[PDB]
Amino acid sequence: VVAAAEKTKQGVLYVGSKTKEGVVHGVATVAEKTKEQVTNVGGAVVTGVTAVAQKTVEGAGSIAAATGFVKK
Amino acid sequence: VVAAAEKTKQGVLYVGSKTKEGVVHGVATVAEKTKEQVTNVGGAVVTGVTAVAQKTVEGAGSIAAATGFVKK
Amino acid sequence: VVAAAEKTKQGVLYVGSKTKEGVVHGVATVAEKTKEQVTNVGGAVVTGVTAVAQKTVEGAGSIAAATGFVKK
Amino acid sequence: VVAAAEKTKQGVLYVGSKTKEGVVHGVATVAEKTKEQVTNVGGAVVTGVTAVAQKTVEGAGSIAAATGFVKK
Amino acid sequence: VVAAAEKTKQGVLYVGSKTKEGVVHGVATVAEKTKEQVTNVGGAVVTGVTAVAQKTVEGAGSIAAATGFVKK
Amino acid sequence: VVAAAEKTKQGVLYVGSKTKEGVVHGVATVAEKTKEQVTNVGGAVVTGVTAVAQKTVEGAGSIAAATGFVKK
Amino acid sequence: VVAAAEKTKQGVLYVGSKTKEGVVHGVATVAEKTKEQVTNVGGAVVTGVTAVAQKTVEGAGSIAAATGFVKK
Amino acid sequence: VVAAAEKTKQGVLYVGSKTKEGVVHGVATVAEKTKEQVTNVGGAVVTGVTAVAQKTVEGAGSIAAATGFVKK
Amino acid sequence: VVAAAEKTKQGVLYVGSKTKEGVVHGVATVAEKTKEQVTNVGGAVVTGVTAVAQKTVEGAGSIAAATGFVKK
Amino acid sequence: VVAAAEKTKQGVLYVGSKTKEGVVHGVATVAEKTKEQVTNVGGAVVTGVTAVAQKTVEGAGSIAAATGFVKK
Amino acid sequence: VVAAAEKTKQGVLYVGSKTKEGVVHGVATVAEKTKEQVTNVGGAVVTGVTAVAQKTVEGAGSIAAATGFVKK
Amino acid sequence: VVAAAEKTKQGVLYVGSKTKEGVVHGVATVAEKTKEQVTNVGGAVVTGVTAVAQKTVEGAGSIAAATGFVKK
């Protein structure tokens, strides 16, 4: 669950959105008269009309993730 | 659950949004007359009409995450 | 749950939003006559019509996170 | 739960918002005649119509987080 | 729960907002005739129509956080 | 719960707001005829129409936080 | 232009409309790069979205209209 | 232009409209780069969204109208 | 232009409108870069959103109108 | 221009409007870069949002109107 | 311009309006960079938001109006 | 310009308005960079927000109006 990144040294990024009457829901639990609902979102969620990820890593870059579920 | 980043040394980023009547919900629990709802959001949630992540890491950069669930 | 970043040494960022009648909800629990609702948001939530993260790390930068849930 | 950052030495950031009739709710619990609601927000929540995070770290910078839940 | 930052040595930041009839709620508990509501906000909440965080760290800078919940 | 920052040595920041009929609520508990409400806000809450945090740390700077809840 | 009317002696109604984004034009003269434009109206022009005329002229009525145009 | 009317002796109604974003134009002369424009009105022009005329002229009425135009 | 009327002797009503963002124009002369503009009105012009005329002319009424235009 | 009226002898009503952001124009002459503009009105012009005329002319009434225009 | 009226012998009403941000113009002459402007009014002009005329002319009434315009 | 009226012998009402931010213009001459402006009024002009006329002319009344304009 260890992320490391070491860097040793010895353009135009455009995003354009023109939205009319936009509706966005992320992690959502919509219900009515339900007895129960279980939601265990624990990861990584990216949601959107214009969801852009330009140059996520450029130099030395590290990403990590870890999830679990034990019920017994 | 350890993140490290060491750096040793010896452009135009544009985002444009023109939204009309926009509605955005993140982590939301909408209900009516429900007996119970369980929501255990614990990760990483990015939500939006113009969700842009430009140059998330540029130099030495580290990201980490960790979630869990034990009920027994 | 340790984050470290050491740095040793020996452009234009534009975000534009023109929103009309915008509505934004973060972590929200909307209900009516519900017996119970459980919400345990404990991670990292970024929500918005213009959600922009430009140059999250530039030099030596470290991010970390940790969540848990034990009920027994 | 330890964050450290040591630095040893031996542009234009623009955000523009023009909003009309904007409504923003952060961590909110809206209810009516509900018997009970439980909300345990304890992480990191960033919510807004123009939610911009430019140059979150530039030099040696460290961020950390830690949450928990034990009910038994 | 320890944060340290040591630094040894041997541009224009613009935010513009033009809002009309804006409404902002932070951590809010709105109710009517409800028997009980429990809210335990203890993390870090940033909420707003123009929520901008430019150059959160520039030199040696450290941020830390810690939350907990035990009910038994 | 210890924060330290030692520094040894051997631009224009603009925020502009033009708001009309603005309403801002921080940590608020609005109710009517409710039997009970429990609010235990103890973290860090930043709320506002123009919520700007420019150059949160520049030199050696440390921030720390700590919250808890035990009910037994 | 002779018109006449004469009269001698000796229920549930509903009109409904639900129109979204309705653009209506009556008498229109749309042009570009002209020299002469003449618009003469001399009768009876009714424009709208719900142009309703109910139970007109119970007795005697004259809607008579005369127009002319001389061009030399 | 002779008009006449004469009269000698010896229920549930509903008009409804629900219009969103309704643009209405009556007599219109839209042009660009012209020299001469003439607009003569001499009759009866009714414009609106709900232009309703109910039970007119119970007895004797004259709507008579005369127009002319001489151009030499 | 002779008009006349004469009369000798010897219920539930509802008009409703719910209009949002309604732009209404009556007699309009929109132009750019002109020399001459003439606008003569001599009849009866009714403009609005809810232009309603109910039970007019119970007895004798004359709406007679005459116009002219001489151009040499 | 002769008009006349004569008369010899020997219920629940509702008009409603709920208009938001309603822009209304009657007789309008919108122009740019002109030389001559003439606006002659000589009849009967009614403008508004709720232009209502109810039960007019119970007895004898004359709405007679005459206009002229001479141009040499 | 002869008008006449004569008369010889021998209920629940409601008008309502709820208007928000309502801009109303009657007779308007909007222009830029002109030389000559003439505005002659000689009839009957009624402007407003709720222009209501109820039960006019119970007996004998004359609304007669005459206008002229000579240009040499 | 002859007008006349003559008369010989031998209920619940409500007008309501709730207007917010209401701008009303009657006879208007808006211009820029002109030389000549003439504004002649000779009839009957009624302007306002709630322009109401109720039960006028019970007996005999004359609203007669005459105007002229000579230009050489």
mmCIF file of C-alpha atoms in Angstrom, chain J:
data_model
loop_
_atom_site.group_PDB
_atom_site.id
_atom_site.type_symbol
_atom_site.label_atom_id
_atom_site.label_comp_id
_atom_site.label_asym_id
_atom_site.label_seq_id
_atom_site.Cartn_x
_atom_site.Cartn_y
_atom_site.Cartn_z
ATOM 1 C CA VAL J 1 -65.215 59.319 -39.564
ATOM 2 C CA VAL J 2 -68.764 58.919 -38.239
ATOM 3 C CA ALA J 3 -69.410 56.550 -35.326
ATOM 4 C CA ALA J 4 -72.557 56.114 -33.270
ATOM 5 C CA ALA J 5 -74.227 54.087 -30.533
ATOM 6 C CA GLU J 6 -77.733 54.075 -29.044
ATOM 7 C CA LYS J 7 -79.770 52.132 -26.469
ATOM 8 C CA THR J 8 -83.418 52.760 -25.558
ATOM 9 C CA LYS J 9 -85.751 51.125 -23.036
ATOM 10 C CA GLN J 10 -89.420 51.568 -22.166
ATOM 11 C CA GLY J 11 -70.910 35.351 -12.299
ATOM 12 C CA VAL J 12 -67.599 33.994 -11.028
ATOM 13 C CA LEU J 13 -64.729 35.489 -13.015
ATOM 14 C CA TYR J 14 -60.987 34.992 -12.653
ATOM 15 C CA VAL J 15 -57.966 36.161 -14.655
ATOM 16 C CA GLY J 16 -54.608 35.071 -13.282
ATOM 17 C CA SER J 17 -50.970 35.274 -14.282
ATOM 18 C CA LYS J 18 -47.743 34.056 -12.661
ATOM 19 C CA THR J 19 -44.952 35.387 -14.875
ATOM 20 C CA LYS J 20 -41.243 35.164 -14.102
ATOM 21 C CA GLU J 21 -38.634 37.203 -16.041
ATOM 22 C CA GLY J 22 -41.207 38.645 -18.433
ATOM 23 C CA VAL J 23 -40.004 41.332 -20.858
ATOM 24 C CA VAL J 24 -42.784 43.043 -22.847
ATOM 25 C CA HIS J 25 -42.445 45.637 -25.624
ATOM 26 C CA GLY J 26 -45.295 47.508 -27.270
ATOM 27 C CA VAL J 27 -44.637 49.797 -30.225
ATOM 28 C CA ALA J 28 -40.859 49.710 -30.657
ATOM 29 C CA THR J 29 -38.448 51.268 -33.170
ATOM 30 C CA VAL J 30 -34.968 49.870 -32.470
ATOM 31 C CA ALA J 31 -32.259 51.041 -34.848
ATOM 32 C CA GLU J 32 -28.595 51.995 -35.176
ATOM 33 C CA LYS J 33 -26.841 54.674 -37.284
ATOM 34 C CA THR J 34 -29.864 56.406 -38.822
ATOM 35 C CA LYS J 35 -30.769 59.925 -39.911
ATOM 36 C CA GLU J 36 -34.563 60.320 -39.785
ATOM 37 C CA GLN J 37 -37.048 58.737 -37.370
ATOM 38 C CA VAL J 38 -40.737 59.612 -37.117
ATOM 39 C CA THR J 39 -43.175 57.961 -34.708
ATOM 40 C CA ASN J 40 -46.812 59.035 -34.915
ATOM 41 C CA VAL J 41 -49.446 57.408 -32.687
ATOM 42 C CA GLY J 42 -53.089 58.373 -32.947
ATOM 43 C CA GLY J 43 -55.284 55.387 -32.121
ATOM 44 C CA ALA J 44 -55.393 53.384 -28.898
ATOM 45 C CA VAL J 45 -52.343 51.465 -27.647
ATOM 46 C CA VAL J 46 -52.570 49.194 -24.590
ATOM 47 C CA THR J 47 -49.397 47.528 -23.294
ATOM 48 C CA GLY J 48 -48.604 45.585 -20.160
ATOM 49 C CA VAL J 49 -48.374 42.104 -18.719
ATOM 50 C CA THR J 50 -52.037 41.540 -17.819
ATOM 51 C CA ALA J 51 -53.973 43.863 -20.149
ATOM 52 C CA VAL J 52 -57.584 43.045 -19.248
ATOM 53 C CA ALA J 53 -60.772 44.834 -20.356
ATOM 54 C CA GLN J 54 -63.996 43.549 -18.776
ATOM 55 C CA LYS J 55 -67.667 44.416 -19.433
ATOM 56 C CA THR J 56 -66.990 47.642 -21.298
ATOM 57 C CA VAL J 57 -69.762 49.723 -22.920
ATOM 58 C CA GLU J 58 -72.836 48.688 -20.924
ATOM 59 C CA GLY J 59 -74.813 51.463 -22.594
ATOM 60 C CA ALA J 60 -73.688 53.522 -25.603
ATOM 61 C CA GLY J 61 -69.999 54.186 -26.285
ATOM 62 C CA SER J 62 -67.851 55.425 -29.170
ATOM 63 C CA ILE J 63 -64.179 54.407 -29.491
ATOM 64 C CA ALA J 64 -63.839 56.421 -32.807
ATOM 65 C CA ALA J 65 -60.337 57.529 -33.821
ATOM 66 C CA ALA J 66 -58.968 59.263 -36.916
ATOM 67 C CA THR J 67 -55.371 59.798 -38.018
ATOM 68 C CA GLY J 68 -53.611 61.405 -40.946
ATOM 69 C CA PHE J 69 -50.166 61.890 -42.426
ATOM 70 C CA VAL J 70 -49.192 64.330 -45.195
ATOM 71 C CA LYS J 71 -45.641 64.275 -46.571
ATOM 72 C CA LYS J 72 -44.524 66.569 -49.398
#
